[model samples]
Target: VVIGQRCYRSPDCYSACKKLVGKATGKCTNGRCDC
Candidate 1:
């Protein structure tokens, strides 16, 4: 699992990471994109 700030946020990332990875969900806790 990779945990860090991402440069892009869209469905593309979701597609690329599909099946190979998991993502954080829910609302941002500290001004970050929570998922």
Candidate 2:
């Protein structure tokens, strides 16, 4: 997921970031896609 994008759930951000294809020091922080 992209930074500053909308995230519906906590797993939405970091879940993708954990993948080898994804990038970030990310998680669902507050109500948005954080990194």
Candidate 3:
């Protein structure tokens, strides 16, 4: 999956990615968004 660094915090990225893919959970690694 593609990761992004659009937000300043890990939780923000996680939530954003989860919403984007409509998944139950997401992860942020090294300040990047992953799903």
Candidate 4:
């Protein structure tokens, strides 16, 4: 299973991603953040 979240910008997504998994990656697409 693949889980993710939506964010407004890359930094937003990166922050969210870091919070969850500690060390992770955030990808932005169509102005959306996939972390």
Candidate 5:
């Protein structure tokens, strides 16, 4: 997955980013994932 993908909640983005980058910290900002 890309770092700037679409996401709903913070936790949702967290897991999505984890898939992209192992053990990473990500956030959902304006419906997009920011890692």
Candidate 6:
């Protein structure tokens, strides 16, 4: 995730999660948070 700016875990759930708890951006891999 980035500092100051928001970031979401890039996954299948990211979409739903982003809808529920909207994120400024996303940073993840293969339905998981690698970093």
Give all candidates' CA lDDT scores.
0.37, 0.63, 0.59, 0.59, 0.67, 0.43
**Residue 18 error, candidate 1, Å:** 0.4
Per-candidate TM-scores read: 0.22, 0.37, 0.39, 0.46, 0.52, 0.33
Q: Residues 1-35, candidate 6, lDDT per residue (tens digit)?
A: 32222335445344545665585334555445432
Sorted on lDDT, highest at the top, how do the candidates line up?
5, 2, 3, 4, 6, 1
Candidate 3 Cα deviation (angstroms), residue 4: 1.3
lDDT of 3: 0.59
Question: Candidate 2 or 3, higher lDDT?
Answer: 2
Candidate 3: misplaced stretches above 4 Å?
6-10
Which predicted model would earn the best TM-score? 5
Q: Which ten residues in a row have the lowest lDDT in candidate 2?
A: 16-25
Off by over 4 Å in 2: 14-25
* Candidate closest to the true structure, highest lDDT: 5
Evaluate model 2: give its lDDT. Answer: 0.63
RMSD per prediction, one decimal? 5.5, 3.9, 2.6, 3.3, 2.7, 7.7
Model 6 ranges off by over 4 Å: 1-10, 24-35
Q: What is the lDDT of residue 27 in candidate 3?
A: 59
Give candidate 5 regions above 4 Å deviation: none
Weakest lDDT window of 10 consecutive positions for candidate 6: 1-10
lDDT of 5 at 6: 78
Which segments of candidate 4 are over 4 A away from where they belong? 1-11
Q: What is candidate 2's CA lDDT for residue 18?
A: 62
